[PDB]
């Protein structure tokens, strides 16, 4: 529908976000995902911490360097949920994956580009009220991720600039509405009402 879709991970549930992201790439839609630190997983923090430690013990006994690799960053926990939903040892699969990008925070390009959401993976739409859940960033710091603070700091900075932007814009569309209303009631506008506009 658009050349590149930018997804605001915040408030999405990992494997449901993954399931849709994977399909899209396979079908040829480039996807970039931001604020993976604000991803969720159902299940209380402790549960998913225990799960993560299960993962953590699997290693190649003769050489741990060849063994399963354990990435600690929310973006990359995420990639993992994703990568495992893609026939990723096939050309067709590598190709789909090159179509993907994932970030903690919203770094340049994407901070001035619109981001969407994916309602069929929106936690607030899916999880029954009262069911505990985990935030990706908090899970990740506990298994080694080093950059929650730095991301938080940048994000607060970015969030201030974006508040300005918004404000300016909302000021501007107020003017624009003031304009659109002198033109209301005019002849060309009554005609357009007639045609559903």
């Amino acid at each position: 529908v658009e050349p590149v879709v930018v997804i605001d991970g915040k408030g999405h549930l990992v494997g449901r976000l993954a399931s849709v992201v994977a399909k899209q790439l396979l079908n040829g839609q480039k996807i970039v995902v931001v604020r993976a630190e604000e991803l969720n997983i159902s299940g209380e923090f402790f549960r998913n911490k225990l799960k993560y430690h299960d993962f953590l013990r699997k290693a190649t006994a003769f050489n741990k360097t060849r063994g399963p690799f354990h990435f600690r960053a929310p973006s990359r926990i995420f990639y993992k949920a994703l990568r495992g939903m893609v026939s990723h040892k096939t050309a067709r699969g590598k190709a789909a994956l090159e179509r993907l990008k994932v970030f903690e925070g919203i770094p340049p390009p994407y901070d001035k580009k619109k981001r969407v959401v994916v309602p069929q993976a929106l936690r607030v739409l899916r999880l029954k009220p009262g069911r505990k859940y985990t935030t990706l960033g908090k899970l990740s710091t506990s298994v080694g991720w080093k950059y929650e603070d730095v991301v938080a700091k940048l994000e607060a900075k970015r969030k201030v600039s974006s508040a300005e932007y918004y404000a300016k814009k909302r000021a501007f569309t107020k003017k624009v509405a003031s304009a659109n209303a002198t033109a209301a009631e005019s002849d060309v506008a009554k005609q357009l009402a007639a045609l559903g506009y």
Partner: protein
């Protein structure tokens, strides 16, 4: 951590310049000769790099080198390195830094008597070492065939791979080490019988 700029002194001793080369004698020694020209223009582009470090920068390290010529060594080529500056505000740091270009700094300005310090250095080299002395493994008995400074069992039958955790012959020494807590007993001065 990522570096965004480096600002350099305008004059550089041949001692450092030499570090930037693999064949000094043959070379035209053109290192930094355009950089040096940046000072000409009033200072314009040097200030703004300095400016840039101040505006941003979570940390400031300074670039120093040794005066290996003041040393009985034969190896002319000096050692260059980044030392993190730790007093004041970031801006005070780069002010310190700019102020000290081409200028010189002494151990007493950094260490004192009875201080506990650490030492970072590459360990002596010993080349290819067998298992006994490299790992402190027990000499096999005198009767054993095929030699005896070895490990008798290099692993069980399964895993059917030699493992990362058993001792094997190979290089010994010329390692990085970070050794800590060495008390300073004297801070001597060169100009002092």
């Amino acid at each position: 951590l990522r570096s965004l700029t480096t600002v350099w002194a305008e004059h550089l001793s041949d001692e450092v310049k030499r570090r930037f080369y693999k064949n000094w004698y043959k070379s035209k020694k053109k290192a930094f000769t355009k950089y040096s020209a940046k000072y000409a223009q009033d200072g314009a582009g040097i200030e703004r790099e300095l400016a840039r470090i101040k505006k941003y920068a979570s940390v400031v390290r300074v670039l120093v080198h040794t005066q290996i010529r003041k040393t009985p060594l034969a190896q002319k080529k000096a050692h260059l390195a980044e030392i993190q500056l730790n007093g004041g505000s970031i801006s005070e740091k780069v002010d310190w830094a700019r102020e000290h270009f081409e200028k010189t700094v002494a151990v007493d300005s950094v260490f004192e008597q009875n201080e506990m310090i650490d030492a970072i250095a590459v360990t002596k080299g010993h080349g290819f070492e067998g298992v006994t002395h490299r790992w402190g493994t027990k000499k096999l008995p005198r009767k054993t065939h095929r030699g005896l400074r070895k490990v008798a069992c290099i692993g069980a039958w399964h895993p059917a791979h030699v493992m990362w955790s058993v001792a094997r012959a190979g290089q010994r020494g010329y390692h990085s080490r970070t050794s800590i807590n060495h008390k300073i007993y004297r801070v001597g001065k060169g100009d002092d019988e």
